Amino acid sequence: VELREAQRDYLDFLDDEEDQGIYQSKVRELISDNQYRLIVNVNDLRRKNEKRANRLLNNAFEELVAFQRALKDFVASIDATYAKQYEEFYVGLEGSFGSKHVSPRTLTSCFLSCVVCVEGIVTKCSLVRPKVVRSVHYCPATKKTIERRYPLETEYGLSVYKDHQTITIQEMPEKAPAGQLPRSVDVILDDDLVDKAKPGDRVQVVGTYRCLPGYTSGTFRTVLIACNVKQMSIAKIKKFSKTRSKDIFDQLAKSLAPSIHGHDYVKKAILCLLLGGVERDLENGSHIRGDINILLIGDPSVAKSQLLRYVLCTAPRAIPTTGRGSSGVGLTAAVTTDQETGERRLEAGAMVLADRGVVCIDEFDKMSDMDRTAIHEVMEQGRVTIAKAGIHARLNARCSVLAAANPVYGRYDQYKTPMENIGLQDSLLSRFDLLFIMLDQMDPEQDREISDHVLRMHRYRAPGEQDGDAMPLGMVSAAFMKKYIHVAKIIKPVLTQESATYIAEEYSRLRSQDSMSSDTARTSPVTARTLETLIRLATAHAKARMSKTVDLQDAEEAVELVQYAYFKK
Amino acid sequence: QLYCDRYLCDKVVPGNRVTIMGIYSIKGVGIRSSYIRVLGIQVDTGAVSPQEEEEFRRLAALPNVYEVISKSIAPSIFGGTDMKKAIACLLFGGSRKRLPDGLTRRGDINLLMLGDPGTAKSQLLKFVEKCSPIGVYTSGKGSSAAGLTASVMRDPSSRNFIMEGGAMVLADGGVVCIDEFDKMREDDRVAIHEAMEQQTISIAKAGITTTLNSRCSVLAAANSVFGRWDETKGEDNIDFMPTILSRFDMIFIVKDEHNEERDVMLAKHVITLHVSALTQTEIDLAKLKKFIAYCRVKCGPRLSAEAAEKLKNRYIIMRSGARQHERDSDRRSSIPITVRQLEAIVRIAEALSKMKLQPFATEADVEEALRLFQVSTLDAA
Amino acid sequence: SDQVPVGNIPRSITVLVEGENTRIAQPGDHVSVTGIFLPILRTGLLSETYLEAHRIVKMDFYEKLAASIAPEIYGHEDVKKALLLLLVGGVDQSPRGMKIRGNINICLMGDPGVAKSQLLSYIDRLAPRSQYTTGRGSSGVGLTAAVLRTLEGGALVLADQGVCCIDEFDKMAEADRTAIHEVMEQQTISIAKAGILTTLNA
DNA sequence: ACACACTCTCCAATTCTCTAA
DNA sequence: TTAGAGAATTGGAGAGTGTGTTTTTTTTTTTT
Numbered sequence A: 001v002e003l004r005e006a007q008r009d010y011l012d013f014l015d016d017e018e019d020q021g022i023y024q025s026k027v028r029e030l031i032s033d034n035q036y037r038l039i040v041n042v043n044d045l046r047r048k049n050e051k052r053a054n055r056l057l058n059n060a061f062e063e064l065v066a067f068q069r070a071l072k073d074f075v076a077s078i079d080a081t082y083a084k085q086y087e088e089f090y091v092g093l094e095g096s097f098g099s100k101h102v103s104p105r106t107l108t109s110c111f112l113s114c115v116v117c118v119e120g121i122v123t124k125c126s127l128v129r130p131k132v133v134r135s136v137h138y139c140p141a142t143k144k145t146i147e148r149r150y151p152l153e154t155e156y157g158l159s160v161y162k163d164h165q166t167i168t169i170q171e172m173p174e175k176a177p178a179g180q181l182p183r184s185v186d187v188i189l190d191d192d193l194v195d196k197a198k199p200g201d202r203v204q205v206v207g208t209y210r211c212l213p214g215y216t217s218g219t220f221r222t223v224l225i226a227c228n229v230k231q232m233s234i235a236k237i238k239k240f241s242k243t244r245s246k247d248i249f250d251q252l253a254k255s256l257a258p259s260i261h262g263h264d265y266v267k268k269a270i271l272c273l274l275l276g277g278v279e280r281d282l283e284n285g286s287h288i289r290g291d292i293n294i295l296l297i298g299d300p301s302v303a304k305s306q307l308l309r310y311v312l313c314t315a316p317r318a319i320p321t322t323g324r325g326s327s328g329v330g331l332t333a334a335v336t337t338d339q340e341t342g343e344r345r346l347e348a349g350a351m352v353l354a355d356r357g358v359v360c361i362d363e364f365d366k367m368s369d370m371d372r373t374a375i376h377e378v379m380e381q382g383r384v385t386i387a388k389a390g391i392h393a394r395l396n397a398r399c400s401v402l403a404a405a406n407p408v409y410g411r412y413d414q415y416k417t418p419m420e421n422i423g424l425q426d427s428l429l430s431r432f433d434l435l436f437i438m439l440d441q442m443d444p445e446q447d448r449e450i451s452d453h454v455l456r457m458h459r460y461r462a463p464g465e466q467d468g469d470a471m472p473l474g475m476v477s478a479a480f481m482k483k484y485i486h487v488a489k490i491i492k493p494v495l496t497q498e499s500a501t502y503i504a505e506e507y508s509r510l511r512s513q514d515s516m517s518s519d520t521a522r523t524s525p526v527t528a529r530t531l532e533t534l535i536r537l538a539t540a541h542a543k544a545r546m547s548k549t550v551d552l553q554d555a556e557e558a559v560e561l562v563q564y565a566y567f568k569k
Numbered sequence B: 001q002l003y004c005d006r007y008l009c010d011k012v013v014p015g016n017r018v019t020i021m022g023i024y025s026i027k028g029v030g031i032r033s034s035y036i037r038v039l040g041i042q043v044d045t046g047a048v049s050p051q052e053e054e055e056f057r058r059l060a061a062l063p064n065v066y067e068v069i070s071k072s073i074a075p076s077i078f079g080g081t082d083m084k085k086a087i088a089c090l091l092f093g094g095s096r097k098r099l100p101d102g103l104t105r106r107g108d109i110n111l112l113m114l115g116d117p118g119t120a121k122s123q124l125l126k127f128v129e130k131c132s133p134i135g136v137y138t139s140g141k142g143s144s145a146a147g148l149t150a151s152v153m154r155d156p157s158s159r160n161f162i163m164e165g166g167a168m169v170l171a172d173g174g175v176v177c178i179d180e181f182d183k184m185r186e187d188d189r190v191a192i193h194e195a196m197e198q199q200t201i202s203i204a205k206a207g208i209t210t211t212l213n214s215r216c217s218v219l220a221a222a223n224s225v226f227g228r229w230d231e232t233k234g235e236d237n238i239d240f241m242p243t244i245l246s247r248f249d250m251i252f253i254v255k256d257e258h259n260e261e262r263d264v265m266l267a268k269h270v271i272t273l274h275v276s277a278l279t280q281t282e283i284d285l286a287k288l289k290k291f292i293a294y295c296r297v298k299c300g301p302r303l304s305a306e307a308a309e310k311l312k313n314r315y316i317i318m319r320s321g322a323r324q325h326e327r328d329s330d331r332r333s334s335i336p337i338t339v340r341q342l343e344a345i346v347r348i349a350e351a352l353s354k355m356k357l358q359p360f361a362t363e364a365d366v367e368e369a370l371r372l373f374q375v376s377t378l379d380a381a
Numbered sequence C: 001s002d003q004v005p006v007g008n009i010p011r012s013i014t015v016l017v018e019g020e021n022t023r024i025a026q027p028g029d030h031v032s033v034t035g036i037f038l039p040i041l042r043t044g045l046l047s048e049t050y051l052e053a054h055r056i057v058k059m060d061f062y063e064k065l066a067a068s069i070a071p072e073i074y075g076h077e078d079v080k081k082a083l084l085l086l087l088v089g090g091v092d093q094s095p096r097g098m099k100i101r102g103n104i105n106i107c108l109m110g111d112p113g114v115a116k117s118q119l120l121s122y123i124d125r126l127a128p129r130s131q132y133t134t135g136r137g138s139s140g141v142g143l144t145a146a147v148l149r150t151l152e153g154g155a156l157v158l159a160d161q162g163v164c165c166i167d168e169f170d171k172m173a174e175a176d177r178t179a180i181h182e183v184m185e186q187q188t189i190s191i192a193k194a195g196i197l198t199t200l201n202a
Numbered sequence D: 001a002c003a004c005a006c007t008c009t010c011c012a013a014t015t016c017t018c019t020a021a
Numbered sequence E: 001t002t003a004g005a006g007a008a009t010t011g012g013a014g015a016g017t018g019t020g021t022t023t024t025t026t027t028t029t030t031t032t
């Protein structure tokens, strides 16, 4: 009956006030926040008692129950009244697990009853619903009662229930072996862990791998009973922004996507898309769109696809899509039959999952127009209306669209106007904020530096790799860039009278010039949407400075950008 | 029906040819099903033994290995030595790279053959499918977009939607042979533009969104618009659009020729090939297959500095010439010269270096790489 | 919808009304409910729940009125009067079946990006009973009513004793054109629940 | 948890037989 | 001659056991 000594070990481990008192402090915090689970770091346990630590990982169940009882006794010794508020306490684990860190592919039947640490990408969820643990019945005519664990009438207030949910984890597709589809596993979430993860999240789950029963065919289904769930995704920024020696926005734009050479204005516009504008609301109930949309058109081999694959790696909550490989149902939402409950419910599509994020559409000119009808409502209003599976609803799909396409006839024709080369409808072309045209002008002076840069890139080898190796199948630093952009997304700067005056006067001047100009010399007409674009771009530039005001410099930069985009051949 | 247990799990995948040893047993009123309990598995076709490594090291060491390999490729087909050399480079491939800012470069090589009927195009495809460690052969006329890349369909059990892999997924890491290439529909050739360059397939259907891998080579065969090449009509023999012609590393034009000496030689070669079917009773196909797999997994080259300098200076001349030809002409050409061609020559230089297990490519290798590209794409342009 | 956290689908709850609380609530109406939350009786340990309701709580003159329409927009003086008379309406004459209807109907043709959106939305906001839709046939419910698994919805239906506004009319389909034609003639529509020829006010 | 089909048991109703009113 | 008590055979009232149970992607012909 050594488990009574094992519980005794855990209780004297938890009583660490004699040695710097970290865990007693954590338990005190748990009490103050009215909580009922604790998170223990396995490194500390391994340091204090090697035998107990190395036994815990290979006997998850029999050891964790002893640990839970030790915690219950310790909190009761601190405060019995608090200990009586909850039926039982729980403990979760963190740290380094060594050999027990696995994936949904490498996890096999020999891991049963070990503590395991699985990681992958979440693909689906069931709905939260209650489960019974103890039921009670009472008789008022006799003052009598009975109980059961898992005449008289049921006592819902003396009975007690707890929450239950199921989710599914999938292997990272980048790590799949050659020529095979990804594998997956089912995770069970219970009590205070429900709804801590949603589809598209990258998670790392700690739990115990276990069979479920099922005459018998001698065959079982295996599930991971979760024990903890984890997610993954100042002075430096202060002194850097305080310098004011140079236009910081130009330096950040120059440093964007170092592999790709040229295309200055495109990089500046993409940085404005990453920073975004700001929303505003009016007393009549109307509101102004804060997010930005961008379109790219051009010849073969001008790095259009690579810029999309870069933004997708350097922005939070970003999604890919290709014109030929996707459907309107897949873009918005699809009805699904739940196998846990049997019920019919909706499942999110690509543009819904990109809410408060970015969505990249490659090969945009190959979509059927019926899909573009779905994209129209999303890009204009940020909402999507659905009328299926007994639900009439207005879902949230607020996102910035970055899209790329190739011109009609494959190679752009100099002897035709922009509206002739571009294959899209004039209604749709009016929705994007900025439209860029890119061309492979075969100048030898430019080919010299381009070819040199490409060849420099192909001779590199990483410092952690040796002279002849080959990989298996399966300027500002990037880290600072991410942190600076992340802080800059809070500032919410405001207009100034001078910037407003400048924008108004300059817009009137631009309108007069456009009135003089002809469709043979412009991509699209200029209207109030131009003012909205100018305001968004000036706001974003002020945001990059972290200046609380929108200044004349921001407005001047914004108008120069749109001037280049609209009034160059 | 087969049952598999303990150490035999995940030893095979579908499409493989295998030999099985097991127990045979049972699982209208009188019907019962039956199946086999497996006790041993042998893949009719493993880690290389030390002896095998010594032989592969010897093959890599000996000095004229390039010609030896060239003669092993499709040995029955008369002539076409340059075409066989290009096929060798396709099988070995360049090298994959991941750059410091996280972007990728594809490494592997795409090849196209276009021209006259009766010139053994289909035979070469039929050989390369057997010579490669991983390979698949399909017809352009008999295939669909959802069949080439990937598909979505409802599970025959349960009620859920499930994913399925097409030809370009099954051949991940190997070669895909597309025969009758000029007889696909336009909207179906559009479907492989992501797979041929970015080597991944992006799907968004039925409430599921994922990205799949396809790291494979494309080898294709086609005719002129007019059935055989008509030199009086020039560029009109080709009607593929520029956005796909630019995704091939090399393009070959094959024309039939009526020289008497070659005809007599070829006739004798054909007749003795037929006659020697009974009488029959340099590297073999099996040996070459294992050698290719070994070289691909162990060796990854890079350019020497001077080799990159030489290639740079050549590329400027090449771009200038192409620009002047289009400027002089009243018409724009179908086969462009772009940065993709600069990368193409580098991939061939790495392949040539890989055959000899050498860590660096050299000016000799760049010279041969430029020669191969000079013949094919500049004859086509 | 505004209470839903980012990137999620909204949820629903069943409410049982009994006794003198019946007939208070209506479809599409905001309410606050007091009740008891309980599990459903069977006939597994996981069970559905509902809310037992105890209380339900719902959440000259011509020139002056013409000048009051869309003052944000410069000019368009008589267009505003036309919209005023659209809201006021004429008279159904009804001489023994030889009917002349009083409802005004008008159409606006706009150049690309012109100010009509502001005027349209002003009339939409102003009118005491009205609805809006767009001709592209979006993923939601259509101009006419629809069926789910009872009948529901439809912009032509939800505006009844009022005015309905159609946007980007030129992108309509033949189904939409025939529906508008039928409304213009008979001011009623038909949708088949399950092959039965049900019909509905418009 | 709630309905058919089947098997089986023990209690006491119906008749034989002997006896008294 | 008419009627009641003691012994033997048989029906059926009752219990126990075993078992069953609209909503999305892809192809093919012919209408445009």
Ligand SMILES: Nc1ncnc2c1ncn2[C@@H]1O[C@H](COP(=O)(O)OP(=O)(O)NP(=O)(O)O)[C@@H](O)[C@H]1O
Pocket: A259, A260, A261, A262, A298, A299, A300, A301, A302, A303, A304, A305, A306, A307, A406, A450, A454, B197, B243, B339, B340, B343
């Ligand atoms: N300025 C450049 N810097 C770096 N790489 C470049 C540059 N220009 C072209 N490339 C190369 O161009 C190749 C193809 O890039 P890609 O993004 O597909 O071009 P694209 O404009 O999208 N052409 P396409 O996809 O056929 O329409 C890549 O392998 C790049 O290495």
Ligand SMILES: Nc1ncnc2c1ncn2[C@@H]1O[C@H](COP(=O)(O)OP(=O)(O)NP(=O)(O)O)[C@@H](O)[C@H]1O
Pocket: B076, B077, B078, B079, B116, B117, B118, B119, B120, B121, B122, B123, B124, B270
């Ligand atoms: N050099 C050669 N050596 C041997 N057989 C040859 C040669 N050239 C052609 N053939 C024969 O040509 C016939 C057709 O072969 P095939 O591979 O279809 O050529 P192809 O170029 O693909 N013809 P096509 O499909 O009409 O374009 C076969 O019977 C081959 O044996």
Ligand SMILES: [Mg+2]
Pocket: A303, A304, A305, A306
């Ligand atoms: Mg591209």
Ligand SMILES: [Mg+2]
Pocket: B120, B121, B122, B123
């Ligand atoms: Mg052939």
